[PDB]
Specification:
- Chain B: ADP binds at residues 198, 236-244.
- This is part of a larger assembly, with three copies of chain A.
- Chain A has 761 residues and is of the alpha/beta class.
- In chain A, the strands form five sheets. In chain A, strands 1-5-3-4-2 form a five-stranded mixed sheet.
- In chain A, strand 3 and strand 4 form a beta hairpin.
- Chains in contact: A-B, A-C, B-C.
- Chains A and C meet through helix 20, helix 23 and helix 26 of A and helix 1, helix 2, helix 5 and helix 7 of C.
- The complex binds phosphoaminophosphonic acid-adenylate ester (4 copies) and magnesium ion (MG) (4 copies).
- Residues 242-243, 295 of chain B line the site of one magnesium ion.
């Protein structure tokens, strides 16, 4: 089996599907099909055909024959590619045009920017010389290019007869009647689509199967005897993808789309907001199938505790009544968008309303890369821009932030060219304008000068850490496999033996021994999402979103199953219940303790969700967290031993320029009782010393050359500046253990007597 | 490399750029260019020229010749310096005036404070004695000084024909028709500019590249394939520079500027605040390129938790809708 | 006349140089590596495949010149310097609330390169009380936890260094010493015989001192005196 969630997105290869390719002819009403492809299509040489494009756009052209066109090719020209909205490499479908429909009229009008420089009737110069007796097929809404000399005027197919498409026979009596098709109309063409949304595939698949399927193929649901949900609610960080995704789905499904912007509704006088809502719903019902996208729904339907006026609760109630009135099932779907899912009134998040919710969260590396590719598809990038590096460096960047980053890169490119650009002149040199290209350094500078927005939001992603990055801890990994991986990859195994596992683990040990890394590594092994939460972050949550922060992170973990919810730095929240119970500063630790235990109680029934903790202070850890049904498994992470420290050094220096004479194993003997953090700080000090050394070396070399320029560039060239043993010796000189010999036997004692904390002392 | 952030502010020295200098003559419609500078400019002795000043202010004068004028000098008189808004040491540019445009009428009116003590028709005492057959170039909106005895009356070029600038030929039939050009009109002249803002260069450069470039040279952004940001938000300690900088940039970029003061919007009855906002945005769109400076925006768009009434959230929502409606990119 | 914007955070390059600071040669030498090199030469660390640390803590006797070192290192790198004191942070919560620490950190982000200095950690960084409780210290707990949260998100900004200073290292919260936070620990000692001469000279670098005054003579007699005492 496989994960069939992302199955609707898959394109089903068919004999009628041909890949896009360049044509041997620039004819706009004629393409060229390979003879074999035509035979599969039952077509013949020079036969009109309908090409199915993207965004519900299609054109009509006569297919020729040529053996150079490989089987998975169609050989269309640039104009057809633009009309279909398909770039090279897309997979269009081909259908026949048996009804050639020799048209009596083919209304043709020009575009203003393609007419600049025409001093004669366009009908007698462009249209008639190429259409009369040519029998060129024409598809309404497609821009065919024409030439009548030096100027090239492109006309849109305004109004054919038949209306859809026809063939331009000699009987087509028509001329150019005015210029009403100015180029600015392109703002509503090629606007949005599936290809314009990147970084979301699971959410996009969910939206498509909840919106497009009920509206295009309701027969499936009717036969299965299930009524599909009518309420969808997109939510996520501001600027992520919501309004784009809604419009993309609406345009791709080809259903009547009505946008109800919250500010627009609330900016009108009382009695017009409700009137507009009623009109929108009525029009959607009349023109079914339909979609009603309510952007910024939080403004028109905020939490009832926050809304003050009566003409706001009235609008909320009107919206609720209208949604309740949609149970007629007139192929109408109401989709929402709100960055504040909790700010929404609870009534909306109910059956018969917005009951199905999709979280358009922060994208991962591949998503950011795809977003950047989408946004830079039009910019004049140079041949040395590496978007992979930028995507790796852009952590916490939503799509809007990436678009702003591209814009800032372009601006920085302009600033570099400001020296050769004079602002006083009302016009800029054309050659200078066309020679501006965005380089990688511009992007790096823009990224340095740009800041992320969704850097505080919880991130649900598979960590990149593997077992290799962690040195030693073989037994800990061996037991973690049983505790986590087996009940996830093989859940039925436990049911086979009639015994359920435990969904809780606690890591206790000296600081810097690799407790945070183990959680990420085990998540990576099981390919399960990882949610990182720190005690300091939890403590500020109560002074803020309040009760709905811990509940929210746990709900997110539930929605993201399988998951590994890690609570680092339990030393603060899990502080043992004070004997003199009191205070509000610790009244937040008591909250993040009791409310957290309450959620732990309800989490054992979810399955495939494991709650892992980490504490450097097992003495103060609340004994309640150790209860069965909670973090009861206790795993001790010891200080690395002689063998483990070699692995730790190697991992810390797995990508370092270390010299050939450095004995990694030698340091292990001298560094005993040092945590992994100290072992990494040793390497950091060594790297800093090497940087100092090679900085001084390069400075001395350049100063030697400048102290008599006649001195030529000798064979001496900048070297690796590898980390010599001297640097490591100097680092070990200042290196100091972060765990004392008196603070290890105590950890051993707690390893012995930790779970006994639920009783007396 | 260098920090190219403060690059737009830099003035690009050009052969047409001359530094300001005192003139050997007090003539207001005549300056004096060094012969070599004229040769670089392809000008000749006694040729009308357009001088590009600051704050979108320029004058027209006939350039003479003199060897005492160093190459980086223009030798303009005090009146020309005042009209151009340029003090000594500024770097103006020089353009030719091939269309001398001998004008049929040169409307001239006086200023009240320069007329105190005149007991005769100003046309027969100041204008005609110095304009008839003098062929003095005149630029609309420039105050040229004249004398008809002891009193010195300075007149503004009210309405020339052609409207922009012309040469005062003998055929210029005109007299002083009233005194509608009282000196108090100077409150709206030489008001604000880049030189009137000090202590901010990085912020000023950012504002200029985010506002003036998209409005004057959108070709760069269009070719690069990037849509420039339309929303800018100045913030800082009260009284620092905000309202001054906004007006300075608006006047220097020479685009239709509309000021929407928050208190003024909120001081009106319900249904007039939103009406005024809509009118402002519509007028800005009509007269593109344009700028819509919303001072004290916090009053009309405060935090929703703090606002209590409905006719305030309505204004906030109207503003949000109007800004969302600006994606048409009409150079606004 | 009185100023108005005297309470607002100021983002400017300090005028203090290494000369105004007497002695501390080793401290300056290590601060160069810790701060200047990852700023002037950021690509150097990427060349060796190892990232630096954006945190430092100054602990030592009062009056030994911990505040001056931060300003001096900012001046050397020509980076903006933001000065924040624990007493100021404690009143922020009783006020702008959550959006004061977030705001100063955002300002530091916008002003990169920057050196965000937290003087007087003796108050905010008071060690988490065993009997956790109270709202007077519920502000120290806020300025501690909320500050650590911001420190966590600051390591990805680059060219922003967070420096602390504490005269009470005993009570300093152990969380601030974590990697990814103020983990580098630099000890500022009491000036020695040689350092005190430099301190006197700096304090009197623009003074009318007579021709018979032996600056070095005082150094011997003043032992154990902090720089503040030498200036007094
Ligand atoms: N996944 C994406 N792929 C491509 N472009 C994107 C993507 N996400 C965002 N963008 C771009 O960024 C813009 C901002 O996203 P938008 O769709 O307005 O977000 P939003 O969630 O509706 N914002 P708000 O209502 O202010 O919280 C889009 O209009 C695109 O130009
Ligand atoms: N076993 C290990 N192998 C390799 N590197 C390690 C190991 N243990 C610690 N380190 C390094 O030291 C850093 C700190 O350890 P970490 O994994 O964060 O432990 P922790 O228990 O979260 N520490 P703390 O929060 O300070 O109590 C890691 O991110 C690694 O860089
Ligand atoms: N940088 C500057 N250069 C010259 N004059 C200045 C400068 N900044 C302020 N001024 C003067 O001080 C006045 C007050 O500044 P103003 O532009 O009104 O500040 P503001 O930020 O708009 N005030 P508020 O809206 O009350 O917070 C200006 O009108 C000038 O007269
Ligand atoms: N090394 C030094 N060289 C010169 N002057 C010094 C030195 N150390 C201290 N001083 C002087 O003493 C003053 C106080 O020292 P400062 O640099 O503020 O230390 P601090 O650690 O901030 N003190 P405190 O906040 O009282 O614990 C300085 O501003 C100087 O005037
Ligand atoms: Mg939206
Ligand atoms: Mg931990
Ligand atoms: Mg103001
Ligand atoms: Mg201090």
């Amino acid at each position: 089996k496989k994960d069939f969630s992302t199955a609707i997105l898959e394109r089903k290869k068919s004999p009628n599907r041909l890949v896009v390719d360049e044509a041997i002819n620039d004819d706009n009403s004629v393409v060229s099909l390979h003879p074999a492809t035509m035979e599969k299509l039952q077509l013949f040489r020079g036969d009109t055909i309908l090409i199915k494009g993207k965004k519900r756009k299609d054109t009509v052209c006569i297919a020729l024959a040529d053996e150079t066109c490989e089987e998975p090719k169609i050989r269309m020209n640039k104009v057809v590619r633009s009309n279909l909205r398909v770039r090279l490499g897309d997979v269009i479908s081909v259908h026949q045009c048996p009804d050639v429909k020799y048209g009596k009229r083919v209304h043709i009008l020009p575009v203003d920017d393609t007419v600049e420089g025409v001093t004669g009737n366009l009908f007698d110069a462009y249209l008639k010389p190429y259409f009369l007796e040519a029998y060129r097929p024409v598809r309404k809404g497609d821009l065919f290019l024409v030439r009548g000399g030096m100027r090239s005027v492109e006309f849109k197919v305004i109004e054919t007869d038949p209306a859809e498409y026809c063939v331009v026979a000699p009987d087509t009596e028509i001329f150019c009647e005015g210029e009403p098709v100015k180029r600015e109309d392109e703002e509503r063409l090629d606007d949005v689509g599936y290809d314009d949304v990147g970084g979301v595939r699971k959410q996009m698949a969910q939206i498509r199967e909840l919106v497009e399927l009920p509206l295009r193929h309701p027969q499936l649901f009717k036969s299965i005897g299930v009524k599909p949900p009518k309420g969808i609610l997109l939510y996520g960080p501001p600027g992520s993808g919501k309004t784009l995704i809604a419009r993309a789905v609406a345009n791709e499904t080809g259903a009547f789309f009505f946008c109800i912007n919250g500010p627009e509704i609330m900016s009108k006088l009382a009695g017009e907001s409700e009137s507009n809502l009623r009109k929108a719903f009525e029009e959607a019902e009349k023109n079914a199938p339909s979609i009603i996208f309510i952007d910024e729904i939080d403004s028109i339907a905020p939490k009832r505790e926050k809304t003050n006026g009566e003409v706001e609760r009235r609008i909320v109630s009107q919206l609720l009544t209208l949604m309740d009135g949609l149970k007629s099932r007139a192929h109408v779907i109401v989709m929402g968008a709100t960055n504040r899912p909790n700010s929404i009134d609870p009534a909306l998040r109910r059956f018969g309303r917005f009951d199905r919710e999709i979280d358009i969260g922060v994208p991962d590396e591949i998503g950011r890369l795809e977003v950047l590719r989408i946004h830079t598809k039009n910019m004049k990038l140079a041949e040395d821009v590496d978007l992979e590096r930028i995507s790796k460096d852009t952590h916490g960047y939503v799509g809007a932030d990436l678009a702003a980053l591209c814009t800032e890169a372009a601006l920085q490119c302009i600033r570099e060219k400001m020296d050769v650009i004079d602002l006083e002149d009302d016009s800029i040199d054309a050659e200078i304008l066309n020679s501006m290209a965005v380089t990688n350094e511009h992007f790096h500078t823009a990224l340095g000068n740009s800041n992320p927005s969704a850097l505080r939001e919880t991130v649900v992603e598979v960590p990149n850490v593997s077992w290799n990055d962690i040195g030693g801890l073989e037994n800990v990994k061996r037991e973690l496999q049983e505790t986590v991986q087996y009940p996830v990859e093989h859940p039925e195994k436990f049911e086979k033996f009639g015994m359920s596992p435990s969904k809780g683990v606690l890591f206790y040990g000296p600081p810097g021994c690799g407790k945070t890394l183990l959680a990420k590594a085990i998540a990576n092994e099981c390919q399960a999402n990882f949610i990182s939460v720190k005690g300091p972050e939890l403590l500020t949550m109560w002074f803020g979103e309040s009760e709905a922060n811990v509940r929210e992170i746990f709900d997110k973990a539930r929605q993201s199953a399988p998951c590994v919810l890690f609570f680092d730095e339990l030393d603060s929240i899990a502080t043992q219940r004070g004997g003199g119970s009191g205070g509000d500063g610790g009244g937040a630790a008591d909250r993040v303790l009791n409310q957290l235990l309450t959620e732990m109680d309800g989490m054992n029934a979810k399955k495939t969700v494991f709650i892992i903790g980490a504490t450097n202070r097992p003495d103060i850890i609340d004994s309640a967290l150790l209860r069965p049904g909670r973090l009861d498994q206790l795993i001790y992470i010891p200080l690395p031993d002689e063998d483990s420290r070699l692995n730790i050094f190697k991992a810390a220096l797995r990508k370092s320029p270390i010299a050939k004479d450095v004995d990694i194993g030698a340091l292990a003997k001298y560094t005993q009782g040092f945590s992994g953090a100290d072992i990494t700080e040793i390497c950091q000090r060594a790297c800093k010393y090497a940087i100092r050394e090679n900085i001084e070396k390069d400075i001395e070399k350049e100063k030697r050359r400048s102290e008599n320029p006649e001195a030529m560039e000798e064979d001496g060239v900048d070297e690796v500046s590898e980390i010599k043993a001297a640097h490591f010796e100097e680092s070990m000189k200042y290196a100091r253990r972060s765990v004392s010999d008196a603070d290890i036997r105590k950890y051993q004692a707690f390893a012995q007597t930790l779970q006994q904390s639920r009783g007396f002392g």
